[PDB]
């Protein structure tokens, strides 16, 4: 059949992307209805970025200070309100390309597509995961700020992410659409570490199911284990522990492959302890934790 | 900065995708202007798929035999002509969503985005490479046939690929838009091997430049080599040989990193011969040959 990393089609979102300007700085904004959502740090200079008093910095801004472009067309900002770390700009015009949408806050391990932009024009799409330490491994250059992550269900767009900053370590932190940072991060220029990151156990499992489906299987073993004895080897190898909820999530996959979750665990535990001695699995030489159980189904 | 595999935004194409039906079988079609392009095997049963006499099979089909849907809307087929392995269906209506486009035949090693569909409705997008043996590693289920590969330059869509079949080995073969198979393949149900596949040398290089840009570098060594002595170790490890054209292609990257192509080669040669002894490079434990030099630039 085949199995690769795969993003939701980006169209529906592409028609919500707008450029937002305020002084020197310009960045990407999400135009839904007669609101335009963007990162609030748009209203900062460099001076301000070391220690911004944002409430102070707003209010001293009038609507006309905010430029919004939708192609070669100008929205007029008629109101402006801040919501945590998002600026929201009410405009005179509703977006005729608004899809059915909602705002969700995702959970660590959940995936989404990112449409990454520069100057309110889409450059590219890729699929991502919300790491345990609330960071994301992606690609984001200058001007990429305000690029969003989403999922599509039937034809409802669930916005989950807005990009804000690149942490020294080369990875990206951002907010949901209500303006709250995933992780303990703050929009200011000061050296912020995400903690040590761990692997998304339940996903790696689902990867091993996918593998077995598309016909790989060398890594399967004789053994089985308890969920506890397993976990005790999980924690040792920077894997997130595995709940019963997680086991439940793997029930369908388990049922299809005729392989019990705790056996899969035993086969995984073994890989952790012996490595892959030069072998590959779905032609990767690493354990892929960025496919959720749900992702694997939909593709399969 | 960051570096991940990244597809062109799919919108522009999503509005060219149509469902095409003929008897039992239904598949994806590309609607540009008042033509709709699709794989010709749509006109086959299973019987016919063992050894199809396509010229025979057409002509005995009238226009009304061809159903085309564009959302919940019906195009009327008013002419039908075959071009090698594509059926082309003239319709009463031009596609108001046709973008600026062209048809290109790509070369092995060139990349493109695939928008993969089922029943003329887009399910997902991913980035791909035209392997040396003219196959592609992708994801394509039943009904995925007629899913296209493309590149965008500014706002011109260069169609390069149409999907036809999955070869036993789990990989996918298809045509350009003029209906000619990349590779020595034919649209019939008979066991066809692609030859042994090799690695895209020039791309792997560009990957090593990207790496060095985003700050990795452990794999750099003291040595240098000749292009010949290099090649003689390339051929041994299933790498495509490296022309002067390829060296020329890496000139810009070389100039940025302050690292001469033949030194990079020496550093690569060394990896080939010693492996990666547990290390990673841009967090992959393999050599990534599916980013062209051009791709790396645009992202960077």
Curated annotation (Swiss-Prot), chains A, B:
Cross-link (Glycyl lysine isopeptide (Lys-Gly) (interchain with G-Cter in ubiquitin)), chain numbering: 5, 90
Cell compartment(s), UniProt: Host cytoplasm; Host Golgi apparatus; Host nucleus
Extent of the signal sequence: none
Subunit description = 3CL-PRO exists as monomer and homodimer. Only the homodimer shows catalytic activity. Interacts with host FBXO22; this interaction promotes the proteasomal degradation of nsp5.
Q: Where, in residue ranges, is this chain on the Cytoplasmic side?
A: 1-300
Instruction: Tell me the organism.
Output: Severe acute respiratory syndrome coronavirus 2 (2019-nCoV)
Q: What activates or inhibits this protein?
A: Inhibited by pyridone-containing alpha-ketoamides compounds 13a and 13b. In turn, alpha-ketoamide 13b (tert-butyl (1-((S)-1-(((S)-4-(benzylamino)-3,4-dioxo-1-((S)-2-oxopyrrolidin-3-yl)butan-2-yl)amino)-3-cyclopropyl-1-oxopropan-2-yl)-2-oxo-1,2-dihydropyridin-3-yl)carbamate) inhibits SARS-CoV-2 replication in human lung cells. Inhibited ex vivo by michael acceptor inhibitor N3. Inhibited ex vivo by compound 11a and 11b.
The name on file for this protein is: 3C-like proteinase nsp5
As its record notes, the protein acts as a catalyst of: TSAVLQ-|-SGFRK-NH2 and SGVTFQ-|-GKFKK the two peptides corresponding to the two self-cleavage sites of the SARS 3C-like proteinase are the two most reactive peptide substrates. The enzyme exhibits a strong preference for substrates containing Gln at P1 position and Leu at P2 position
Q: Which function does this protein serve? A: Cleaves the C-terminus of replicase polyprotein at 11 sites. Recognizes substrates containing the core sequence [ILMVF]-Q-|-[SGACN]. Cleaves and inactivates human TRMT1, preventing tRNA guanine(26)-dimethylation of tRNAs. May cleave human NLRP1 in lung epithelial cells, thereby activating the NLRP1 inflammasome pathway. May cleave human GSDMD, triggering alternative GSDME-mediated epithelial cell death upon activation of the NLRP1 inflammasome, which may enhance the release interleukins 1B, 6, 16 and 18. Also able to bind an ADP-ribose-1''-phosphate (ADRP).
The catalytic residues are 41, 145
Q: Which residues belong to any copy of the Peptidase C30 domain?
A: 1-300
């Amino acid at each position: 059949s085949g199995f690769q990393k795969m993003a939701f089609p980006s169209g529906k979102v592409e028609g919500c992307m707008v450029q937002v300007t305020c002084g020197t700085t310009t960045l990407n904004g999400l135009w839904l209805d007669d609101v335009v959502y963007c990162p609030r740090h748009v209203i900062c200079t460099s001076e301000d970025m070391l220690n911004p008093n944002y409430e102070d910095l707003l209010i001293r801004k009038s609507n006309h200070n905010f430029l919004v472009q939708a192609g070669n067309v100008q929205l007029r900002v008629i109101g402006h309100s801040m919501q945590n770390c998002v600026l929201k700009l009410k405009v005179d015009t509703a977006n005729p390309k608004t899809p059915k949408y909602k705002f969700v806050r995702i959970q660590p391990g959940q995936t989404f597509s990112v449409l990454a932009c520069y100057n309110g024009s889409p450059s590219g799409v890729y699929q991502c995961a919300m790491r345990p330490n609330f960071t994301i491994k992606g690609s984001f250059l200058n001007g990429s700020c305000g690029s969003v992550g989403f999922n599509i269900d039937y034809d409802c767009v669930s916005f989950c992410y807005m990009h804000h900053m690149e942490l020294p370590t080369g990875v990206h932190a951002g907010t949901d659409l209500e303006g709250n940072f995933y992780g303990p991060f703050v929009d200011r220029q000061t050296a912020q570490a995400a903690g040590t990151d761990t692997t998304i156990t339940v996903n790696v499992l689902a990867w091993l199911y996918a593998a077995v489906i598309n016909g790989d299987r060398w890594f399967l073993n004789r053994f089985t284990t308890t969920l506890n004895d397993f976990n005790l080897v999980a924690m040792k190898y920077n894997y997130e522990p595995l709940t019963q909820d997680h086991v439940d999530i793997l029930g369908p996959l388990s049922a299809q492959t005729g392989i019990a979750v705790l056996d899969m665990c035993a086969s995984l535990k073994e890989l952790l302890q012996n490595g892959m001695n030069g072998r590959t699995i779905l032609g990767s030489a690493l354990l892929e934790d960025e496919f959720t159980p749900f992702d694997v189904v939909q593709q399969c």
